[model samples]
Target: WGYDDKNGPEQWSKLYPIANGNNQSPVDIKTSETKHDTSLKPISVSYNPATAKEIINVGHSFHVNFEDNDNRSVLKGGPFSDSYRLFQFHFHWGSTNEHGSEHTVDGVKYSAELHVAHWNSAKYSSLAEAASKADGLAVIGVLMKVGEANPKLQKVLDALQAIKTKGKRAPFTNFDPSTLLPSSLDFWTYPGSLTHPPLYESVTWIICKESISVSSEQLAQFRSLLSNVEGDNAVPMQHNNRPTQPLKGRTVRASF
Candidate 1:
């Protein structure tokens, strides 16, 4: 179902009880209230430009799948106890450029949010197995702000034309997810979840402080993506983000 009110995020818990769990995601990131952990290490990302396989519109957002059969693109350090391998990356956007990010900065929403989904390769046998464990996944979130047109994102934006409709797919390769990351690696670490279906709480979130730029035009193209399948009334995607969840006493560590 689409993110329409009748079958939206608020009603997700009705379908999946874990949606109402204590360790939910998309919490408002209040910078001042967060703790600074000196023990936090700088995050490390090793992504292979040729590891990307394809892109597809999965009814909510477009995802660029990686060839995760090996550790070609791995993420480690930060608040992680083990290395996490990249499997895929996706985005969440709004109907407009001002309110699309899942995690807000001091209550201010960004134009969009990029999520690089990874699974702990050290402990879990597969990504599917990692979803059920507490320390099984690590996700890197880089917020996007409206400003200059990022040439790095141009390739992805161009591919949008091919996968405009839900279920549509196209070959996408030779793209490095790291190229889309902001220059500064300073981040805030905390415990969170998938922010979508099944609402798995296995993710260890590392959100960057700096944001990449995107022009209004690029954002409009993102909005052009359809949330419904072709001939299904073509409901345009307005929102695909979950509301801020309670902190629930989770300690947010910063690497500053």
Candidate 2:
């Protein structure tokens, strides 16, 4: 389903019942209300540039797919009992720099958001097997603020032109997804669902407290992507982010 008035987030519940389920994601993280969990350990991330396979424009957004045959690139620690293997990474952005992020902080929306998706490899055999279970997927959410041009982010942005149309695929190798992370790993953790449809309530969201930078020009490149393929009436892909959902009594824990 597309992010339009007829098939947008509000209409998703009609088709995907889980869209209206409790524990949905992309919540407005109220910093003051978060509880500090001293027991949470530091996040451990080890990425291998070699595992990066290709990039594709998946209509809604683009994703850099990875080779998850083994534990070459994985996320561990920080509220996780098992190591999660990296699978794919993508982004969400608005038409303009004013507001695009799925998850907001203190009611403040960022220019964009980055999602690094990983599956619990220690327990599950594969990402497909782990997707629908609780404690199965762990996604690292990094907020992107508009300011100085981020050199690290430029590589991915530059590759966008090749896969500008929906369903287009391009070779995007030797890319280290970890380079997109902010300096600090301190984050807020909570149980939530996938931001989009199929909306499984299985993700353990680890949103970084700090934000990374993305220039206005760079963000515009994201809007350059087309929701449709070359033929069927072009639609600029923008405002793909889902609005912040209700917290519904979930306690967000701070890992500082």
Candidate 3:
């Protein structure tokens, strides 16, 4: 349910049986073990800044939702046979900069991770309808390291002041999610789950090999958000990332 020791990732399987599935997410990516796939095509991303609707604190994390009524902000190619429409994007972080990312590289953890979730529009009608199928979702995972301050990330960090508690929301418009992406599109592709409860094994995970930058202050801002509502005892929302799961004989393909 929550990220506490009593009900965190370890206890998720008790209620959500799918949490124990083979195709689980946030796998540790061992670069030396990954196979380079020449057949993997470059991913295509087209985003409309106006499609960004709002940012909300959903207790667990904050989500920057987009207008997905059309394919205005969509992803194509890169191990996907059909196009997927972007609906929302969110982040996973920790209480400290030591570790927070869901997916790690060579057993190393980053300060944070970003997940841009999209659903197959060509085959399924909505995100809910597509979430249960094998080819339903495609998530782009971007690792964030603590470094020089990122000006681009500051916008979202500033907006957090207004939505400090759960269920809080504010207008977040004209924001192009692509600006948050690293210059290179080179990625590692594989099949994984949602990395949380009701962990659906339907996502085609595309994790950027290159990482983005985030300052220590910026990361602290993320931890400032409260998981509980305004009236409740303030609980800093931190370490919201699930631990890496088993690869289960799945081959991770590199698109270099």
Candidate 4:
């Protein structure tokens, strides 16, 4: 049920048959093979700081959940045919910083990746109902590079001290995700599935080509997080990323 010898990615197909499906996620992004579409507009992300509610550690990763009752924070434009409401955001990183990103570009892997997940409220009523359909979730990925210290990311790290163990939650409000984005809005997009269990093929992935800056010290804070309860001998939650899946004839479009 986790990333180990017997129950790792190779063994996931047994529990979750969808893991071996056609349109799987975290594909090796071949930039040369991608089609540059001029028709694709810049992806519009309007996030209301008020909508940010709380942060929690669910063993796998830390998630900042938003209040999506209304269209307060939304993801539109770009490859999307309809408006998608922001629900939550999370991350995936390695024990070290060499290679942690779920999706790689021409075999180049980043230190980490951030996923801001959204669901199509225009077509579906709720995130639960939307996840069962094709055109449901729209996940925006921001790759992380080890460089300068990111002050905005420090805010998140500060909160992590309080939520070191799994199932722990803390109030996280007035946080604007836009502050964590890179300068360039250029991205690579395609149809894909969730990286982990259930492996839902309901996501339309929009991966940012440009990576955001973060320091090694800041990254070390992430390794402090534990997958098990605090009182127990909890293991550090590291390398929670999934392996790259087969493209399976899926076309990747570039928004430049």
TM-scores of the candidates in the order shown: 0.96, 0.98, 0.98, 0.97
Instruction: Give the number of colliding residue pairs in candidate 4.
Output: 0
Q: For candidate 3, give the lDDT of residue 29.
A: 97
lDDT score for residue 138 of model 4:
95
RMSD of each: 1.2, 0.9, 0.8, 1.1
Please list the C-alpha lDDT of all candidates, in the order they appear. Answer: 0.87, 0.93, 0.93, 0.89
Displacement of residue 163 (Cα, Å) in model 1 is 1.2
lDDT agreement of model 4 with the native:
0.89
Spell out the clash pairs found in candidate 3: none
lDDT of 2 by residue, 101-210 (tens): 99999999999999999999999998889999898999999999999999998889889889988999999899889999988899999999999988999999999999
TM-score of 4: 0.97
Report lDDT (Cα) of residue 127, candidate 4.
Answer: 93
Whole-model lDDT, candidate 1? Answer: 0.87
Least accurate 10 contiguous residues by lDDT in model 1:
234-243
Kindly give the number of clashing pairs for every candidate: 0, 0, 0, 0
**Deviation in Å, model 4, residue 245 alpha carbon:** 0.8
Residue 28 lDDT (model 1): 86
